[PDB]
């Protein structure tokens, strides 16, 4: 009498790509919060927009936000940064042509 | 972050 429902749009997990928010336990569509797919691995961690306003979360203080990881700063790679390295790992560690 | 895809 009704499959579970997630994110804003209280749609189920049909299968595409989400986001678990750390404020509260649910999970958000990529496409319901207008962010791009590719970023995927460049989120540290998420929240959503209700735990931000203070509304779901479990604060009372301030109020969570949404942190991102460093990209790789290869044009092409969207895997995220290593330590103090300012690539994804050694297969791109290349900064300059010569 | 915790991601989740089943496709
Ligand atoms: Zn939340
Ligand atoms: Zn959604
Ligand atoms: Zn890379």
New binding site residues.
Partial sequence: TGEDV????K?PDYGELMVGCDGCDDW??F??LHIPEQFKDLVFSFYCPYCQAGITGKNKGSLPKTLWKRKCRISDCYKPCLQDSKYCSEEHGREFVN | ARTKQTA
């Fill in positions: 997630y994110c804003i749009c749609r958000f569509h496409t319901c």
